[PDB]
Amino acid sequence: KESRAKKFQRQHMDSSSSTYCNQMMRRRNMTQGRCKPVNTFVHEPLVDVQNVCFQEKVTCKNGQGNCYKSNSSMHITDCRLTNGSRYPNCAYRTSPKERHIIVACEGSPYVPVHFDASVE
Amino acid sequence: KESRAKKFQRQHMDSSSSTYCNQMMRRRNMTQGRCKPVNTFVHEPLVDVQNVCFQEKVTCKNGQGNCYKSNSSMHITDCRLTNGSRYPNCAYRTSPKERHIIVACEGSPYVPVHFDASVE
Ligand code: NA
């Protein structure tokens, strides 16, 4: 009753991750008052990301503040607003990647406070 | 009232991926009667995976049938059962990766029917 092809779908396909940005940009309030054009989410334990503040210091994109690059590449997702989107209708392409992340850190305790960029 | 650090958490952290395999292995029935020890899920449009049947032919892992390797590397997730797990409680480590996928295809229409392996 279950075809080989359907069973391959059931066992190895999950294209639904495509829905992730639309869901999360909204849930996390980056579509209040404006559609945030780009955003990156990091899928790692908080602690691991926090530790980056004590890894390789580098120059922030704009030359301002103190930035740090992850020793390891990390799982992230880039969300990009579609060209067609107009507030209050915010749709996003979801792009999973493995990349080193660059964060800006400050304060006491010294912790991440901006996502600067990612890198191959 | 929202600290810069909390805002970074809200805008760029999502550590919840670590439970993906536990959820999906269950939802897709690979924890009925047994804990399936390993499994891979592909996060790409179905169509893009189907098109692999028309990309580079290669030898299947066990030398049997017709297998094909993706031109591009694709977003996937490997699930590995933990050594401690015992049916009916199946816990999995979730490992996102970018890899070329190798599928076996057959039939008319010619479509994927087994996940053979992945490759760097
Ligand atoms: Na699809």
UniProtKB/Swiss-Prot annotation, chains A, B:
It is an enzyme of class 4 (lyase). One of its GO terms (biological process) is defense response to Gram-positive bacterium. Glycans are attached at N29, N71, N83. Keywords: Disulfide bond, Endonuclease, Glycoprotein, Hydrolase, Lyase, Nuclease, Secreted, Signal. It catalyses: an [RNA] containing cytidine + H2O = an [RNA]-3'-cytidine-3'-phosphate + a 5'-hydroxy-ribonucleotide-3'-[RNA]; an [RNA] containing uridine + H2O = an [RNA]-3'-uridine-3'-phosphate + a 5'-hydroxy-ribonucleotide-3'-[RNA]. The active site is at H12 (proton acceptor), H114 (proton donor). Residues 5-20 are annotated as: Disordered. Changing N62D: Substantially decreases binding affinity for RNH1 but maintains high conformational stability. Its EC number is 4.6.1.18. It comes from the Eukaryota. Residues 5-14 have a biased composition (Basic and acidic residues). Its main location: secreted. Belongs to the pancreatic ribonuclease family. This is Ribonuclease pancreatic. The chain holds residues 29 to 153 of 156 of the full protein.
